[PDB]
Amino acid sequence: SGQLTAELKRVTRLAAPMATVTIAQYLLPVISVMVAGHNGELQLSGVALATSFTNVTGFSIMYGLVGALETLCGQAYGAKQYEKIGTYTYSAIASNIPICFIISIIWFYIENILISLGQDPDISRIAGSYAFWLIPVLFAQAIVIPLTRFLLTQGLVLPLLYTAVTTLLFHVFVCWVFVLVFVLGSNGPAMATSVSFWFYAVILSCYVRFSSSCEKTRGFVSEDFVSCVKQFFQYGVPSAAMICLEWWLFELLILCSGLLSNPKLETSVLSICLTTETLHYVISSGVAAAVSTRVSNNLGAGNPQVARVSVLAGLCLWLVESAFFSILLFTFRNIIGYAFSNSKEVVDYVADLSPLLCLSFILDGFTAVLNGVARGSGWQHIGAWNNIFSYYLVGAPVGVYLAFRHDLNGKGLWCGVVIGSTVQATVLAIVTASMNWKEQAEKARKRI
Ligand SMILES: CCCCCCCC/C=C\CCCCCCCC(=O)OC[C@H](O)CO
Predict the structure, then answer these.
(1) N or C: which end of the chain has fewer CB within 10 A?
(2) How far is CA 15 from CA 2, 20, 129, in A?
(3) Could you tell which of 233, 234, 427, 432 is best to mutate to test the pocket of ligand 1, judged by most ligand atoms within 8 Å of the CB?
(4) Nearest CA to 365 among 321, 299, 309?
(5) Which atom of ligand 1 is nearest to the CA of 435?
(6) Euclidean distance between CA atoms 303 and 285, whole angstroms
(7) Burial 31-63 (b: 16+ CB within 10 A, else e)
(8) Within 13 Å of residue 241, how many CA atoms lie on the same side as its CB?
(9) CB atoms within 10 A of CB 242
């Protein structure tokens, strides 16, 4: 009772700003698409195919790698190794640059890749140009996302929130400018995203460089620069997979929906369900980041007990958040489809799909908090191999079978999600109960 209250206050102190941070982070591509309008059926499929490509190969890796910074910097703030936080962060930037180069090399070929996959050459040309103008966003994120974990792993969530909201409003302005006054064309939104993310880079760099809050953590020691890069890849390769295997699968999901009977019907309804799923996953990502932060810090501080109650408090947040969003959807299960489409067949499809998505809500929340525990403790490789096991070896076969042979074209798809997500939580539950907190604190000591 006395221990839960203590960490519940500090986990929530990180949970709310990072939740709003995540809201402002996913509401940025939505702003790109909305400002552009429907310039054309060709440009619609070209930009969608471009941003889907870019997210599958390059962006998921970049966003997933600094799970290494969540464990390394997160445990380093607990042991008060304040020089190593800056060393880990700037070694992450240095590591991200050659990876950005590789991804850009691959992006130069996107047109020839898509035409070889059997797509329209003109759609592949639009996608090639749009993806080519998203290259500055790669190196910009190589600066921003390590800085993101730099502020998060210490508890400086408010500078992250202020700079994120500022970046969102900036992106609204220059998307308006680029699309409406500069009339660039289809790639206007892409270049506006490059400008916005570099603005995010200079404001985060400005705060970290000129603020008293980051006086103890800013700066890197030259000697350890070779060691930290090694350690970052140690915990970067699994974490990146733990993100890629999810985004890739969701991409596979939408393509599978395009091969069913009535493809527009099932694809529109499935896009509704997964937009809803991610819209809850942003708050679920906020609670996950908070749990990862506090557990990593308590493991670094040599206190496994407070790390346990850290997990408990995050599960409490999961309970109230997931019950809230689940019951809230179920109240408007028969109307919420009207917000997405005007066809009556679609609204009833998502209406029948609503309880299964409620299960997806509570499952995604549970697996996100426990995956945050995995990132904060340092066993991300468990999460990666469980991702392949839960979604590719179980969920995808049961999802494909139920959807195609059982005349459950759209619902069967989502059933493969739920069962897969369920298996995911089950193993994530076992490994978080059997795990020794005594050793994780001692193991965190030698990591840092
Ligand atoms: C039933 C189907 C299951 C499918 C497979 C799902 C993944 C779980 C597999 C093994 C976890 C075993 C528990 C391992 C706990 C130790 C984690 C750890 O920290 O290992 C670090 C290691 O010493 C390096 O330095």
Answers:
(1) N
(2) 20, 9, 38
(3) 427
(4) 321
(5) 15
(6) 25
(7) bbeebbeeeeeebbbbbbbbbbbbbbbbbbbbb
(8) 17
(9) 24
Overall size of the chain counted in residues: 448
Query: Of all atoms in ligand 1, which is nearest to the CA of residue 440?
Result: 19
Integer angstrom CA distances of residue 444 from 3, 74, 218, 299: 22, 10, 22, 6
Do 92 and 69 touch, CB atoms closer than 8 A?
A: yes
Q: Which of ligand 1's atoms lies nearest the C-alpha of 389?
A: 4
Solved using: X-ray
Amino acid at 282: V
Q: Ligand 1, residues 431, 439, 445: which to mutate, most atoms within 8 A of Cβ?
A: 431
Q: What is the resolution of this structure in A?
A: 2.9
What's the rounded Cα separation, in Å, for the pair 346 and 268?
A: 8
How far is residue 36's CA from residue 185's CA, in Å, rounded to a whole number? 9
Question: What type of residue sits at position 341?
Answer: S
